[PDB]
Amino acid sequence: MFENITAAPADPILGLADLFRADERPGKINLGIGLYYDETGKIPVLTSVKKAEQYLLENETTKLYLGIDGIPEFGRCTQELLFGKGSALINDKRARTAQTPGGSGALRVAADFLAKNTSVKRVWVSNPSWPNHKSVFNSAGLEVREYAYYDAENHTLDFDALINSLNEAQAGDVVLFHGCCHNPTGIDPTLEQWQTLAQLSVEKGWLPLFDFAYQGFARGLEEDAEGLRAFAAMHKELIVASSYSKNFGLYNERVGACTLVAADSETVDRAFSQMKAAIRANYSSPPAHGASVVATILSNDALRAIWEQELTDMRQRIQRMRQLFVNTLQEKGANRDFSFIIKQNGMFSFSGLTKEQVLRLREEFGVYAVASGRVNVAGMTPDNMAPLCEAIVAVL
Amino acid sequence: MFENITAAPADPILGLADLFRADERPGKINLGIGLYYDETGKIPVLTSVKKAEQYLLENETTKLYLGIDGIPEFGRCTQELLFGKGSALINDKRARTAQTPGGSGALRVAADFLAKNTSVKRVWVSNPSWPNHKSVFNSAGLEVREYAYYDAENHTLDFDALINSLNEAQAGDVVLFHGCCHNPTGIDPTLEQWQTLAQLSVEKGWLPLFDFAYQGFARGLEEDAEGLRAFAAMHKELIVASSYSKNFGLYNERVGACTLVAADSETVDRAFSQMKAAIRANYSSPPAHGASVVATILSNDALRAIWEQELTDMRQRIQRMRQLFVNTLQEKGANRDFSFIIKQNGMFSFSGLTKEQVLRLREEFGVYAVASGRVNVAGMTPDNMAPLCEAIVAVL
Ligand SMILES: Cc1ncc(COP(=O)(O)O)c(CN[C@@H](Cc2ccc(O)cc2)C(=O)O)c1O
Numbered sequence: 001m002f003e004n005i006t007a008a009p010a011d012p013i014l015g016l017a018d019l020f021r022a023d024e025r026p027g028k029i030n031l032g033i034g035l036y037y038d039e040t041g042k043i044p045v046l047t048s049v050k051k052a053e054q055y056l057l058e059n060e061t062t063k064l065y066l067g068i069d070g071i072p073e074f075g076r077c078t079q080e081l082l083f084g085k086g087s088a089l090i091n092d093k094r095a096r097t098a099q100t101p102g103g104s105g106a107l108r109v110a111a112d113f114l115a116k117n118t119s120v121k122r123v124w125v126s127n128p129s130w131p132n133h134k135s136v137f138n139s140a141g142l143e144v145r146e147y148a149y150y151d152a153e154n155h156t157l158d159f160d161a162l163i164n165s166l167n168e169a170q171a172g173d174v175v176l177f178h179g180c181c182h183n184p185t186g187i188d189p190t191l192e193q194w195q196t197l198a199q200l201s202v203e204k205g206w207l208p209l210f211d212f213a214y215q216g217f218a219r220g221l222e223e224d225a226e227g228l229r230a231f232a233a234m235h236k237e238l239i240v241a242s243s244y245s246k247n248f249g250l251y252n253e254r255v256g257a258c259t260l261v262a263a264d265s266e267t268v269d270r271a272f273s274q275m276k277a278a279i280r281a282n283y284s285s286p287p288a289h290g291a292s293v294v295a296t297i298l299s300n301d302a303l304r305a306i307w308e309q310e311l312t313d314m315r316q317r318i319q320r321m322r323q324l325f326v327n328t329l330q331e332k333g334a335n336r337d338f339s340f341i342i343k344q345n346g347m348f349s350f351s352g353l354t355k356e357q358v359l360r361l362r363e364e365f366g367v368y369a370v371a372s373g374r375v376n377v378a379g380m381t382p383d384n385m386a387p388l389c390e391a392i393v394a395v396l
Numbered sequence: 397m398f399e400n401i402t403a404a405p406a407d408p409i410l411g412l413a414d415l416f417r418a419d420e421r422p423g424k425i426n427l428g429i430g431l432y433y434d435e436t437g438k439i440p441v442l443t444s445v446k447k448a449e450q451y452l453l454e455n456e457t458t459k460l461y462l463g464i465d466g467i468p469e470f471g472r473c474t475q476e477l478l479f480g481k482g483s484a485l486i487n488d489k490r491a492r493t494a495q496t497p498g499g500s501g502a503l504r505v506a507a508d509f510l511a512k513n514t515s516v517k518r519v520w521v522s523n524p525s526w527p528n529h530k531s532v533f534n535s536a537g538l539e540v541r542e543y544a545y546y547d548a549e550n551h552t553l554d555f556d557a558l559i560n561s562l563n564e565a566q567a568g569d570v571v572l573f574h575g576c577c578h579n580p581t582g583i584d585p586t587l588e589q590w591q592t593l594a595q596l597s598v599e600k601g602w603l604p605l606f607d608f609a610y611q612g613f614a615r616g617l618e619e620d621a622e623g624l625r626a627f628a629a630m631h632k633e634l635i636v637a638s639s640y641s642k643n644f645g646l647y648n649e650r651v652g653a654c655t656l657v658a659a660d661s662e663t664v665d666r667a668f669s670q671m672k673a674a675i676r677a678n679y680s681s682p683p684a685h686g687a688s689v690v691a692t693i694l695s696n697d698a699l700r701a702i703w704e705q706e707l708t709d710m711r712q713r714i715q716r717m718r719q720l721f722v723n724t725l726q727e728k729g730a731n732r733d734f735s736f737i738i739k740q741n742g743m744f745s746f747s748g749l750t751k752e753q754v755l756r757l758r759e760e761f762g763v764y765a766v767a768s769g770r771v772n773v774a775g776m777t778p779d780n781m782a783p784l785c786e787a788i789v790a791v792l
């Protein structure tokens with residue numbers, strides 16, 4: 001049976017890892033995958049989480065199957081964190097949430113729900129975009145089409161080119177928006193541009209699906225949900241695929257949520273029921289550990305207090321490593337003017353290096369960036385800066 | 397968008413939980429979902445588990461993304477428990493293993509891999525079978541045909557209707573077997589009956605797909621893997637969906653595995669890149685806790701030793717709950733002769749009860765079995781024995 005099977009091509013991102021993990025060179029830097037690092041070059045486990053885990057250790061009496069929808073309380077929490085204190089979405093009981101294996105699994109769940117229970121045939125995804133967006137959607141049968149976004153020549157959001165693109169989307173189409181910290185550009189639309197698309201997309205008849213894997217690294221919690229919050233006000237229906245792998249450091253435990261919002265509760269209920277079935281034929285029920293951490297924390301004032309500060313801390317060191325990055329570039333002999341890098345939010349930076357640059361940075365200096373020229377600021381440290389900035393400077 | 401969505405009818409097993417949960421009558425018993433219970437009727441967390449968790453607590457420095465295929469250890473270990481320490485398979489590097497969100501997720505990973513890369517068209521699954529095999533396979537767009545298996549009248553494995561109903565299996569079809577502990581019958585083919593099927597399947601050109609989710613509750617670890625190991629000798633190609641949910645009480649952390657057998661290293665290799673690819677479009681990478689807890693315990697002679705006993709002890713108490721069940725049954729009324737029960741393996745028993753019988757125990761006595769009339773031995777205790785045996789008796 002498998003004599004004919006053909007070797008697939010590796011994950012452009014995740015596959016880099018393997019590569020990295022294999023060079024035996026000394027000074028190898030890894031600006032690949034989006035991992036938050038600390039000053040001392042490591043991927044710590046936050047403190048609020050070890051505290052959460054200890055609590056679990058001494059408190060857990062069973063490993064009982066969770067519901068298909070996970071821990072209720074983790075849901076309440078995701079919602080509040082998503083919509084706000086006493087939103088009508090919550091007051092109206094218009095949202096139903098499901099704990100899933102990461103934000104990558106909230107996607108896959110969404111798209112099996114859409115295709116099986118809807119008339120959705122197409123999903124529009126920005127250009128550029130997170131390479132897995134397509135494969136996820138494709139796998140559920142859906143067609144993926146791309147809209148314009150990124151003004152190369154000037155490092156922004158080309159609004160009108162964006163708008164003009166989406167004028168080709170039929171009603172009933174699904175439009176895919178990154179909540180904040182666009183991956184991999186780092187550019188995000190103002191509150192007005194969100195208010196815009198918000199009105200538009202309502203008139204145009206689109207289904208908006210928000211990929212929110214970074215609440216907290218742009219400006220902060222409550223303010224990084226604005227776009228999303230503008231949308232909710234308008235729409236009767238929407239879907240959000242959220243991740244807690246970056247803001248809780250829980251990468252390998254897989255914590256995320258799939259939120260569904262309908263016109264009302266009777267609906268949402270009916271609709272949610274089908275979502276479950278989508279799960280039940282996938283993985284059945286979600287993993288406990290990681291999500292129980294999340295609720296525990298979000299539920300406790302002290303622990304929360306602690307986590308929030310851990311967050312703002314992660315964010316601030318990033319904002320720091322970015323200023324530091326250009327400065328040194330500048331101070332190191334860099335052709336281009338990189339200051340547009342200080343206009344990008346989140347863990348990355350859409351560098352501007354060509355495929356052959358990124359290819360050379362690696363074979364020749366041991367540096368590791370995604371071929372799009374995506375660079376992970378969070379992987380930058382005062383101890384690697386110089387050497388880093390020197391290789392780049394040599395390849396430019 | 398969601399205005400015409402048809403509510404779905406709930407999972408037949410998990411759905412039962414909901415009902416149990418919301419029921420308020422004091423003496424309610426729950427013989428539904430396959431969860432191991434203790435003398436006092438709790439679903440305790442194994443000592444070897446707690447122990448390994450502690451270890452992780454103290455020693456975990458990171459939550460870094462696992463690989464697509466998970467913890468190498470975890471795999472290396474799974475194949476061993478699957479094929480046996482010395483096995484050629486291992487020595488021939490013909491197996492590849494991916495850590496997954498349970499036995500469910502492995503099933504699904506199997507389906508999405510087949511579907512997408514094989515030209516497999518139909519999957520054959522017993523009658524009766526576990527109700528999710530269908531849903532899983534369908535959702536991958538596969539045809540589910542049934543083979544015959546259980547001989548009601550004398551409660552047994554009719555090898556005859558078995559062999560005859562599979563005569564229509566086609567070459568390239570996929571035959572699906574429960575390695576041991578048949579859910580929901582509890583009847584298994586003998587090493588001989590196994591030796592034979594292995595012979596056919598070869599001769600008739602089938603892809604066997606083993607569903608192993610209870611290794612250790614029949615006879616014991618190595619004993620229960622006979623059928624599988626017989627197959628492994630003959631076959632060149634094989635698929636195995638394993639789960640640790642029951643033998644390690646890890647129900648809610650989703651731990652199981654998917655093993656791919658091929659003729660050679662190169663093959664399995666190519667063929668596994670494809671599998672990974674299928675993983676990347678679903679959930680990305682596996683959840684770490686639970687699996688880490690398994691490699692921990694299986695790589696440590698000591699905790700291992702502690703493990704193998706908690707298991708042995710779970711089995712023993714089950715077998716005791718069996719012989720006590722019939723004993724109290726007879727000794728309490730019973731027209732029927734339930735003596736065939738003692739001949740079933742694992743947590744359940746195909747009771748021989750009526751749809752309308754289980755509807756009444758539930759409604760009138762708080763008892764909770766599945767509709768097929770499948771009862772959990774494991775959810776039986778010395779304290780509840782009487783009261784259950786009374787209602788069952790009053791509905792005969
Ligand atoms: C925008 C975006 N959305 C979702 C995800 C996946 O999040 P999880 O919660 O499932 O981890 C990511 C992840 N992006 C990171 C990490 C990653 C993970 C898997 C694969 O295949 C590739 C990358 C990244 O490297 O950009 C998003 O970025």
Ligand SMILES: Cc1ncc(COP(=O)(O)O)c(CN[C@@H](Cc2ccc(O)cc2)C(=O)O)c1O
Nearest residue numbers: 409410429430498499500526579609639641652
């Ligand atoms: C026969 C069978 N095969 C596989 C599995 C996989 O369970 P995992 O928890 O490892 O994924 C099971 C488990 N079935 C139990 C519990 C259950 C699980 C999911 C759903 O939807 C319903 C019940 C059972 O009671 O049969 C098998 O049983």
